[PDB]
CSV table of N, CA and C in Angstrom, one decimal:
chain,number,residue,atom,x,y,z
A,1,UNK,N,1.9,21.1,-14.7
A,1,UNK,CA,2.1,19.9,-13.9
A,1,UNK,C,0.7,19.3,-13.5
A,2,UNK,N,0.8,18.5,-14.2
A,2,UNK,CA,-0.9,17.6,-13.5
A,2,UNK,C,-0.5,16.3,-13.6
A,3,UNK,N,-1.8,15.9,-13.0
A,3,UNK,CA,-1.7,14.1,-12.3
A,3,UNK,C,-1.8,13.2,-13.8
A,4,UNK,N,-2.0,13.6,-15.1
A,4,UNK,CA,-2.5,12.6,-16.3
A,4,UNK,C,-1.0,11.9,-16.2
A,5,UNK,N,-0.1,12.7,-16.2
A,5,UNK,CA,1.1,11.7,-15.9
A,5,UNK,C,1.4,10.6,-15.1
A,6,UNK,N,1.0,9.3,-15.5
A,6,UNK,CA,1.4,8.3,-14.2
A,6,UNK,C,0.9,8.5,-12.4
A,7,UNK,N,0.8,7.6,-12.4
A,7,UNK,CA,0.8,8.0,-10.4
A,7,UNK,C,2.1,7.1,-10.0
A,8,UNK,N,2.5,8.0,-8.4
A,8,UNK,CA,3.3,6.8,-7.7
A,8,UNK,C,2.5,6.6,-6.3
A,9,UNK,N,3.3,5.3,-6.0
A,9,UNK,CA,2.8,4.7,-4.8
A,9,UNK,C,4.1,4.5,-3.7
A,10,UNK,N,4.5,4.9,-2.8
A,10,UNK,CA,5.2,4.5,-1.9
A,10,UNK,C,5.0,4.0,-1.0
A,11,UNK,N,5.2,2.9,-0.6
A,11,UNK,CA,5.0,1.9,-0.2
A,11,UNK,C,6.4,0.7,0.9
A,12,UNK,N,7.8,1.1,0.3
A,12,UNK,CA,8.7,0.6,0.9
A,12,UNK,C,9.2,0.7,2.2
A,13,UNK,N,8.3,0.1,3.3
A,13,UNK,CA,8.9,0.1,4.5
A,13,UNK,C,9.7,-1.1,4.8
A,14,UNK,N,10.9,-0.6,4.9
A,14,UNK,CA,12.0,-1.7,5.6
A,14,UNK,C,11.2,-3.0,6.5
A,15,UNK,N,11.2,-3.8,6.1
A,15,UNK,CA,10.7,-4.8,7.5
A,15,UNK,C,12.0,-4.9,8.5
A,16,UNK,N,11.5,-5.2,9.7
A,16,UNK,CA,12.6,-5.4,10.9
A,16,UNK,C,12.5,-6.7,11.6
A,17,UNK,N,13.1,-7.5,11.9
A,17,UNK,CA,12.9,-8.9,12.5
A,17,UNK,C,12.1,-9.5,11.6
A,18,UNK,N,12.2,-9.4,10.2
A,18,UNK,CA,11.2,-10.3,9.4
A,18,UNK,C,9.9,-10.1,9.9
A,19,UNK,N,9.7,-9.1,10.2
A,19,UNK,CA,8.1,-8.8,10.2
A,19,UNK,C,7.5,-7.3,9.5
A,20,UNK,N,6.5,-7.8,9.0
A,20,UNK,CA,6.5,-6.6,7.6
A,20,UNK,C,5.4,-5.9,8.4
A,21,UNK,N,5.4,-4.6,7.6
A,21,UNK,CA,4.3,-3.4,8.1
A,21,UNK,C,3.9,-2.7,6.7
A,22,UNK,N,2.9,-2.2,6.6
A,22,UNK,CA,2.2,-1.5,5.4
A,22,UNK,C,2.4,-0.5,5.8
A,23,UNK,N,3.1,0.2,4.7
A,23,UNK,CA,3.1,1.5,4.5
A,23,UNK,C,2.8,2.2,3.0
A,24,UNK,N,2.2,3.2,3.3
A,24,UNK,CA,1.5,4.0,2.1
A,24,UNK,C,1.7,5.2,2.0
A,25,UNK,N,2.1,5.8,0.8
A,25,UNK,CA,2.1,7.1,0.7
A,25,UNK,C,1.4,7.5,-0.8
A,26,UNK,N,-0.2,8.5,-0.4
A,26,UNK,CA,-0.3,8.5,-1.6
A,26,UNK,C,0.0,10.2,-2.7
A,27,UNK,N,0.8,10.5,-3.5
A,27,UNK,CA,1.4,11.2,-4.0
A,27,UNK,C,1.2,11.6,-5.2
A,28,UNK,N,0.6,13.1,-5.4
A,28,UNK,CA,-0.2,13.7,-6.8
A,28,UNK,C,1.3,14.1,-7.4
A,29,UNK,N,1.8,14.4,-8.4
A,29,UNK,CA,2.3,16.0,-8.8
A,29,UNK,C,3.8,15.8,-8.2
A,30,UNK,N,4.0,14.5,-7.7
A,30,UNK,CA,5.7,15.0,-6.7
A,30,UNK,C,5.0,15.4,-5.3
A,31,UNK,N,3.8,16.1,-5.1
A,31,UNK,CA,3.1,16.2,-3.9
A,31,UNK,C,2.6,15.0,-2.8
A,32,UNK,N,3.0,14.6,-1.9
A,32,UNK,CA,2.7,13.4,-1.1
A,32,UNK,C,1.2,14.2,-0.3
A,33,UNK,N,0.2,13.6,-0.1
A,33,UNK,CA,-1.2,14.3,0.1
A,33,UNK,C,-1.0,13.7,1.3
A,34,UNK,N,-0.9,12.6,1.7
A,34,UNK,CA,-0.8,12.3,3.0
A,34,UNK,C,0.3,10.7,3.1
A,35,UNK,N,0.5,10.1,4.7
A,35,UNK,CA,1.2,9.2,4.5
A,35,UNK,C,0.8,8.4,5.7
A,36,UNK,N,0.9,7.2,6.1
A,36,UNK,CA,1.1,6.0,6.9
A,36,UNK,C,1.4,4.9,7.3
A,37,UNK,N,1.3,4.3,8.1
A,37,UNK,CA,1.9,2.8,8.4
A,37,UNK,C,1.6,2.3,9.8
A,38,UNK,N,1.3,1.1,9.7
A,38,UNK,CA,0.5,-0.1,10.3
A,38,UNK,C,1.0,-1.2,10.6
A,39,UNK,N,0.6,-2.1,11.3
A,39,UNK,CA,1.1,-3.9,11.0
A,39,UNK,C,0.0,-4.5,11.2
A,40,UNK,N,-0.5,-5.1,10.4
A,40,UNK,CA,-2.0,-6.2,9.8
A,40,UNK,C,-2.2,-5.8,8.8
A,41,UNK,N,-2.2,-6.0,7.9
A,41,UNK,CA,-2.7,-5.9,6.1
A,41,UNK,C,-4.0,-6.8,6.2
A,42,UNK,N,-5.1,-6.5,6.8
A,42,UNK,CA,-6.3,-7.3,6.9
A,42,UNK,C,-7.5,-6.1,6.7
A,43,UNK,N,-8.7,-6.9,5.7
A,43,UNK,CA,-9.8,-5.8,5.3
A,43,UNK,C,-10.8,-5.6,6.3
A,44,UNK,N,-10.2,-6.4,7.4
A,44,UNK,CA,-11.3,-6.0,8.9
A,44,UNK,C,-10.5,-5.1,9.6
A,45,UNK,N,-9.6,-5.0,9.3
A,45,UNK,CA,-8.7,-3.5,10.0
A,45,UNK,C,-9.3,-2.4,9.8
A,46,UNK,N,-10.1,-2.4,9.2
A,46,UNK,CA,-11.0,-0.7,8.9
A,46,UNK,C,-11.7,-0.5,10.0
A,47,UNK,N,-11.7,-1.3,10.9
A,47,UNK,CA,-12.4,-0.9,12.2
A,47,UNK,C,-11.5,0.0,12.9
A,48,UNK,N,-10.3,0.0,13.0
A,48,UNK,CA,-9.1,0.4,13.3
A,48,UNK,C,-8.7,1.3,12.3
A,49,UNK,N,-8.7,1.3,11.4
A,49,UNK,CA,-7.9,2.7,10.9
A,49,UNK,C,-8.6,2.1,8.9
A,50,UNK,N,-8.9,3.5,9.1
A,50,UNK,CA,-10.4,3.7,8.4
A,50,UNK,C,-9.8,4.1,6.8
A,51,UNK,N,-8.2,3.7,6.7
A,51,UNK,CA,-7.4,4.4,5.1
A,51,UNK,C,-8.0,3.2,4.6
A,52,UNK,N,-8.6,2.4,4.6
A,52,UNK,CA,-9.3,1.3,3.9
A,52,UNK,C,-9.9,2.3,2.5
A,53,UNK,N,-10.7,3.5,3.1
A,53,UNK,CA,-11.5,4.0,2.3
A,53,UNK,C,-10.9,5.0,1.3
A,54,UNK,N,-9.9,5.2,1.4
A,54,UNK,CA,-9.0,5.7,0.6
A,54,UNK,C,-8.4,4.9,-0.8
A,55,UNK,N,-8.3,3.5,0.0
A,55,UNK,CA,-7.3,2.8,-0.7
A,55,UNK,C,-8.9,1.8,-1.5
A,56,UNK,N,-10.1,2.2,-1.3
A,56,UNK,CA,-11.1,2.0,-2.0
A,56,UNK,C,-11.4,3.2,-2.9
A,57,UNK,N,-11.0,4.0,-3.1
A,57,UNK,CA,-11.4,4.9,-3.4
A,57,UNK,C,-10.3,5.1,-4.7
A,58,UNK,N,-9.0,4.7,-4.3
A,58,UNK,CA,-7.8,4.2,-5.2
A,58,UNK,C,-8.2,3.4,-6.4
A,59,UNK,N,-9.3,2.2,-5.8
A,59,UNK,CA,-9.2,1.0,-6.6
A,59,UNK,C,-9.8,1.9,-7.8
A,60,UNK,N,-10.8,2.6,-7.8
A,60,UNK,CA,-11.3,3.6,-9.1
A,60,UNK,C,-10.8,4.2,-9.5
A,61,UNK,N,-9.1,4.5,-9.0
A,61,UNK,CA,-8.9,5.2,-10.2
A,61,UNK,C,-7.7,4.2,-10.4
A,62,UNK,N,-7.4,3.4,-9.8
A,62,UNK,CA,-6.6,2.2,-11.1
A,62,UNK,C,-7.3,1.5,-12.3
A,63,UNK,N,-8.7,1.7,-11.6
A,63,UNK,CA,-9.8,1.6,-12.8
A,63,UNK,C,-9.8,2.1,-13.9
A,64,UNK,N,-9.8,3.9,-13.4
A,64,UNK,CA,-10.0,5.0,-14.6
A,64,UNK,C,-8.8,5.1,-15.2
A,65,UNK,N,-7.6,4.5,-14.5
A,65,UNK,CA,-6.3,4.5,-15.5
A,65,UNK,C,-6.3,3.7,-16.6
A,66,UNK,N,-6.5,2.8,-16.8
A,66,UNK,CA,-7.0,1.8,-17.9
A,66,UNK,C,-7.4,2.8,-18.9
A,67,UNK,N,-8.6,3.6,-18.6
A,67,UNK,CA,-9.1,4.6,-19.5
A,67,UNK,C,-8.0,5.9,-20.3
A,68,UNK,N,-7.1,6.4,-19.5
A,68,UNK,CA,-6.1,7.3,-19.8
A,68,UNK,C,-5.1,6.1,-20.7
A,69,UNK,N,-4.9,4.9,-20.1
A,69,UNK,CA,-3.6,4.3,-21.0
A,69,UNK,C,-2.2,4.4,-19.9
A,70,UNK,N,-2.4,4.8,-18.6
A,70,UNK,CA,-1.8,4.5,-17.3
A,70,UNK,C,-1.7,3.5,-16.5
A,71,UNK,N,-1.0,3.1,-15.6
A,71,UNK,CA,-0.6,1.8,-14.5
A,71,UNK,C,0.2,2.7,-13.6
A,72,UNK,N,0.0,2.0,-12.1
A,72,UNK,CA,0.8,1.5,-11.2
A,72,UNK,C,1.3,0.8,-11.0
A,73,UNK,N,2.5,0.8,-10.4
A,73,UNK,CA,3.3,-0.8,-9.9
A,73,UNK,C,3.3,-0.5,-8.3
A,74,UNK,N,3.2,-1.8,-7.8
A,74,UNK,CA,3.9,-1.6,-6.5
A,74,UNK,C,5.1,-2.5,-6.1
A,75,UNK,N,5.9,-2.1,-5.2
A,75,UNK,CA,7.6,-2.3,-5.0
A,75,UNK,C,7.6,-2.6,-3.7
A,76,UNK,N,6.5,-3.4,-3.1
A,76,UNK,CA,7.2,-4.2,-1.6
A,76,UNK,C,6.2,-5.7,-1.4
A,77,UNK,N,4.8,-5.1,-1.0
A,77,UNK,CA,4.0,-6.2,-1.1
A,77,UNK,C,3.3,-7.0,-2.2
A,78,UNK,N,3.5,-8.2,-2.6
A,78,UNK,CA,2.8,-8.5,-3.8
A,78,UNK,C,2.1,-9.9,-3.4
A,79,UNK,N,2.4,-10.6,-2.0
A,79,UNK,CA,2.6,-11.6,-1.6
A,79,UNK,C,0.9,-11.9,-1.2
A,80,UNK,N,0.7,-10.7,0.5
A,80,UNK,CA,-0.7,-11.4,1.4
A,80,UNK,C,-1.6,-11.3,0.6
A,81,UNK,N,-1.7,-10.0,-0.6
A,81,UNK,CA,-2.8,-9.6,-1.4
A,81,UNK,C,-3.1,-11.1,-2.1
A,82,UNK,N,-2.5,-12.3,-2.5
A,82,UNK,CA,-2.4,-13.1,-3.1
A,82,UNK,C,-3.2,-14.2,-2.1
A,83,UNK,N,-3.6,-13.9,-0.8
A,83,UNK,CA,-4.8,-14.4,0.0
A,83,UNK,C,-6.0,-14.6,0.0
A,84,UNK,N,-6.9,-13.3,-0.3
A,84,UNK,CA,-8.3,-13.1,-0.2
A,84,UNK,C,-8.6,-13.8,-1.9
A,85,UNK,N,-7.7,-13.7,-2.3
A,85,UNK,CA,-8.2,-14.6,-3.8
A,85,UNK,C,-8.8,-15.6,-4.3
A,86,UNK,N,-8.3,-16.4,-2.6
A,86,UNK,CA,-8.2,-17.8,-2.9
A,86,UNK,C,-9.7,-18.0,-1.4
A,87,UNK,N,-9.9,-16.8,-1.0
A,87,UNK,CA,-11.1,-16.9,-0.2
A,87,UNK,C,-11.9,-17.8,0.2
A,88,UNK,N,-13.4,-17.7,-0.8
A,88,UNK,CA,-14.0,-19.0,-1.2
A,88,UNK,C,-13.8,-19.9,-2.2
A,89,UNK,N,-13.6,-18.9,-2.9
A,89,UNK,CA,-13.7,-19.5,-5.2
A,89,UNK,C,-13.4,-18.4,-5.9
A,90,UNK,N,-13.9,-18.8,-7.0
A,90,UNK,CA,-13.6,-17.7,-7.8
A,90,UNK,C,-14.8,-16.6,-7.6
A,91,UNK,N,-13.5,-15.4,-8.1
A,91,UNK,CA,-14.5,-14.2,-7.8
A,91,UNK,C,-15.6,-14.1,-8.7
A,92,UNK,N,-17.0,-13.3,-8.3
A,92,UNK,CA,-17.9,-13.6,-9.2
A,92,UNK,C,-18.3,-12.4,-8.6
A,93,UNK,N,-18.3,-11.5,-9.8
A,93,UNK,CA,-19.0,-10.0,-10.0
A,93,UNK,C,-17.4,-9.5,-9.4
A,94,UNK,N,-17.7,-8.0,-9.9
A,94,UNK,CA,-16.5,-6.7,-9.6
A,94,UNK,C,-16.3,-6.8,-7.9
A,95,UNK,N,-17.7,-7.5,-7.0
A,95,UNK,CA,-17.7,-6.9,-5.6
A,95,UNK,C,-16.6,-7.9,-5.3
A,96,UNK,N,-16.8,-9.6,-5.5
A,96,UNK,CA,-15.9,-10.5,-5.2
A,96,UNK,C,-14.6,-10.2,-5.3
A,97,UNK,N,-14.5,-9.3,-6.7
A,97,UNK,CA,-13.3,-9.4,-6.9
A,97,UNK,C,-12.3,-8.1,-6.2
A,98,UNK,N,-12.9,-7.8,-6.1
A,98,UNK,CA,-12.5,-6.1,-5.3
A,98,UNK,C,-12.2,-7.0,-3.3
A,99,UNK,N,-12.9,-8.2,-3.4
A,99,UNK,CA,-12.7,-8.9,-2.1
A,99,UNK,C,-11.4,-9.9,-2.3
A,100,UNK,N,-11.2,-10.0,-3.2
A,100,UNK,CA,-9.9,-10.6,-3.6
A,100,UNK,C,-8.4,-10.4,-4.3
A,101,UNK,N,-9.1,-9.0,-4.6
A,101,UNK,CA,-7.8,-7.9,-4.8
A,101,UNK,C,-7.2,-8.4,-5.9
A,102,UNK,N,-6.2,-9.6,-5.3
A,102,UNK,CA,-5.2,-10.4,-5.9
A,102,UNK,C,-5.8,-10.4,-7.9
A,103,UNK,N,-7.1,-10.7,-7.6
A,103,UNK,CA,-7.6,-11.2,-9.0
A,103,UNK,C,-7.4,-9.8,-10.1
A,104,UNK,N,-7.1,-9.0,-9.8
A,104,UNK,CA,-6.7,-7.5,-10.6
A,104,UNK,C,-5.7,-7.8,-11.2
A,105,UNK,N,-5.2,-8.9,-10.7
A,105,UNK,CA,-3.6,-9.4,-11.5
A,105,UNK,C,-4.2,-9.6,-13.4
A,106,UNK,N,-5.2,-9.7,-13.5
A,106,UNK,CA,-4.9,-9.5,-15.3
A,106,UNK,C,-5.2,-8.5,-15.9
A,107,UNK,N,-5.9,-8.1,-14.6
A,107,UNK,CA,-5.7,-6.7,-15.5
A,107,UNK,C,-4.2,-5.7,-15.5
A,108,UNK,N,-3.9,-4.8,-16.8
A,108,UNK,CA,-2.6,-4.9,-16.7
A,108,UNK,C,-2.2,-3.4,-16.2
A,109,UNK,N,-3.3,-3.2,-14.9
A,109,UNK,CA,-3.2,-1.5,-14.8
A,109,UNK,C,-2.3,-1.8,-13.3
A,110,UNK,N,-2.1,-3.1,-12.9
A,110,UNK,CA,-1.5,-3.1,-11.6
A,110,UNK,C,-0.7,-4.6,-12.1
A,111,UNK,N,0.3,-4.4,-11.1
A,111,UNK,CA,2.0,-5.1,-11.7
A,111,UNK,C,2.8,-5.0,-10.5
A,112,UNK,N,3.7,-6.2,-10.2
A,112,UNK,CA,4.9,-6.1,-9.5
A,112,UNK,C,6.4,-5.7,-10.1
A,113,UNK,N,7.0,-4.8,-9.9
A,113,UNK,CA,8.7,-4.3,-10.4
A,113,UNK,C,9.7,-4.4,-9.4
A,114,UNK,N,10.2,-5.6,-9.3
A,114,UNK,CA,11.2,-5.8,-8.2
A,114,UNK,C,12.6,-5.0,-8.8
A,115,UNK,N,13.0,-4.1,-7.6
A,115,UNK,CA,14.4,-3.5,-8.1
A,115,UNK,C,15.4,-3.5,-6.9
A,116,UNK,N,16.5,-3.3,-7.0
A,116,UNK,CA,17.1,-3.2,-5.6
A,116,UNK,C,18.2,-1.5,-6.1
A,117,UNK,N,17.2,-1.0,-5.1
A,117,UNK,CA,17.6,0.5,-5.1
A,117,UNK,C,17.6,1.0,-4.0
A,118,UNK,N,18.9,1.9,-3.0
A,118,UNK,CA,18.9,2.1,-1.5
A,118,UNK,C,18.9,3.8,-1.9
A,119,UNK,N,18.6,4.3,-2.8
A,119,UNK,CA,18.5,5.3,-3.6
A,119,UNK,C,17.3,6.1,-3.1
A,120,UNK,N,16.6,5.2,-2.1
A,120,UNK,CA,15.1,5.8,-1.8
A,120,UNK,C,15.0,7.5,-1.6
A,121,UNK,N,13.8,7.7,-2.4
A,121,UNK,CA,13.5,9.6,-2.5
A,121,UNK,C,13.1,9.6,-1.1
A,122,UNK,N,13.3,11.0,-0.6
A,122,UNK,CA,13.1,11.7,0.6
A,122,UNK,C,11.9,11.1,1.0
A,123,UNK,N,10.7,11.3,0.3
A,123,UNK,CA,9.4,10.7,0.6
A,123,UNK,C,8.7,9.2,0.7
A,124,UNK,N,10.1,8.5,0.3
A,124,UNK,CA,9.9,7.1,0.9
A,124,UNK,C,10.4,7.1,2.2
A,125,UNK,N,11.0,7.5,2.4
A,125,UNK,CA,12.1,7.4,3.9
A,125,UNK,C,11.2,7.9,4.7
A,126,UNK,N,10.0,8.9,4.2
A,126,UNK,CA,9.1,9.4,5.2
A,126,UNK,C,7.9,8.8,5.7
A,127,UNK,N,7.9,7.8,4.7
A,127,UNK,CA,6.9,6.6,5.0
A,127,UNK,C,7.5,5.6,5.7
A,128,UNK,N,8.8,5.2,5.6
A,128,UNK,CA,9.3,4.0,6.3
A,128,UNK,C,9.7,4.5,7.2
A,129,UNK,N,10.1,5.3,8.0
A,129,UNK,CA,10.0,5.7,9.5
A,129,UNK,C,8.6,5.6,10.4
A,130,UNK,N,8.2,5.9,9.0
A,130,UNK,CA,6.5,5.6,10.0
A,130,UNK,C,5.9,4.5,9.9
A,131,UNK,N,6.4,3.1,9.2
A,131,UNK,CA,6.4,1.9,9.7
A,131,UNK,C,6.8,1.7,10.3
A,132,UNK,N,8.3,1.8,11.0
A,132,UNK,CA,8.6,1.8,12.3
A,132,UNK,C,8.3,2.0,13.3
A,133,UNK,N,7.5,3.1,13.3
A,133,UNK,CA,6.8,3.5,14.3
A,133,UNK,C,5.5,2.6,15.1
A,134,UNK,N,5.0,2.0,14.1
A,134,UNK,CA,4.2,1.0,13.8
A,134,UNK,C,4.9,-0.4,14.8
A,135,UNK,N,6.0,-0.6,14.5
A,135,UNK,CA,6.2,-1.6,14.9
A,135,UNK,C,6.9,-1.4,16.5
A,136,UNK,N,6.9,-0.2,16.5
A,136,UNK,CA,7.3,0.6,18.4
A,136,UNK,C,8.8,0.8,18.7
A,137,UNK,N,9.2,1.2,17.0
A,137,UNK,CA,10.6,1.8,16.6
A,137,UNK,C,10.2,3.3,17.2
A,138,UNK,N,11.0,3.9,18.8
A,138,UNK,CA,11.0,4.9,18.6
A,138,UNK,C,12.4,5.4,18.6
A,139,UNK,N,13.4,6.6,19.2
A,139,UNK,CA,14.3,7.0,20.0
A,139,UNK,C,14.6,6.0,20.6
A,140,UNK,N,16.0,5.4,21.1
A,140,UNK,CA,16.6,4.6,21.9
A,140,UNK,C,16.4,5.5,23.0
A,141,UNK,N,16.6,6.3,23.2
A,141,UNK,CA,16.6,7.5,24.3
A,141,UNK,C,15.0,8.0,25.0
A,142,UNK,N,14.0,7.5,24.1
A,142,UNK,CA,12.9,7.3,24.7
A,142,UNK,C,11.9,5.7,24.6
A,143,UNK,N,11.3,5.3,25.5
A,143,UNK,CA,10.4,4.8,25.8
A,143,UNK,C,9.0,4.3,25.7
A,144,UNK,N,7.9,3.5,24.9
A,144,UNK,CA,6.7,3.7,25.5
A,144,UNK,C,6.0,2.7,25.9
A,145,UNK,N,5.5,1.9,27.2
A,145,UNK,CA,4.7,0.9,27.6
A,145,UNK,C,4.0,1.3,28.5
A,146,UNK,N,3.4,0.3,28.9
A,146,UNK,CA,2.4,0.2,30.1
A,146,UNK,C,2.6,-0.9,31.1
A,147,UNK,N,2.1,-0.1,32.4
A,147,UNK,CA,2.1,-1.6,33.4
A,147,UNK,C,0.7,-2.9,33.2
């Protein structure tokens, strides 16, 4: 059992009131290494929660997958990433483009696959609770604010 096999990404957090939250889960082997969830999909949010560097660290190996003959798909957001693209202009050099995300769209190591499946594995359900959380889904039976 090793990673040459494909990767997944989970990523499907329910949105609630029409308002979406990022959720990530990144997963070797069937193994979930770690998991999270947020609300702002923005590259100044690293000041706040530092998985930026992870999900930079990602972009090299959607990179190095090219090299093996692998892709990821992702199955929720395909949409804000389609923002920083349109930034200034066109991207110019890997750094621009790495600022515009979106522009990875030709390359064919990353893709949207829309499916409608409620089928979700254990370890999506474990990431979409924790968008909820995010959005201050706790227990009806508990509470959290401030005066």
């Amino acid at each position: 059992m090793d990673d040459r096999t494909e990767y997944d990404v989970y990523t499907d957090g329910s949105y609630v009131n029409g308002q979406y939250a990022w959720a990530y889960a990144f997963v070797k082997d069937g193994k979930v290494h770690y998991e999270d969830a947020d609300v702002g999909k923005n590259p100044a949010a690293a000041t706040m929660r530092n998985v930026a560097g992870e999900i930079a660290a990602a972009l090299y190996a959607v990179k190095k997958a090219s090299q093996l003959g692998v892709k990821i798909r992702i199955l929720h957001d395909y949409a804000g990433i389609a923002f920083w693209a349109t930034g200034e202009w066109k991207a110019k050099n890997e750094f621009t483009q790495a600022y515009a995300k979106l522009m990875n769209q030709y390359r064919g190591i990353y893709s949207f696959e829309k499916v409608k499946a409620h089928s979700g594995n254990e370890f999506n359900d474990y990431v979409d609770m924790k968008a909820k959380s995010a959005l201050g889904i706790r227990d009806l039976e508990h509470h959290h604010h401030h005066h």
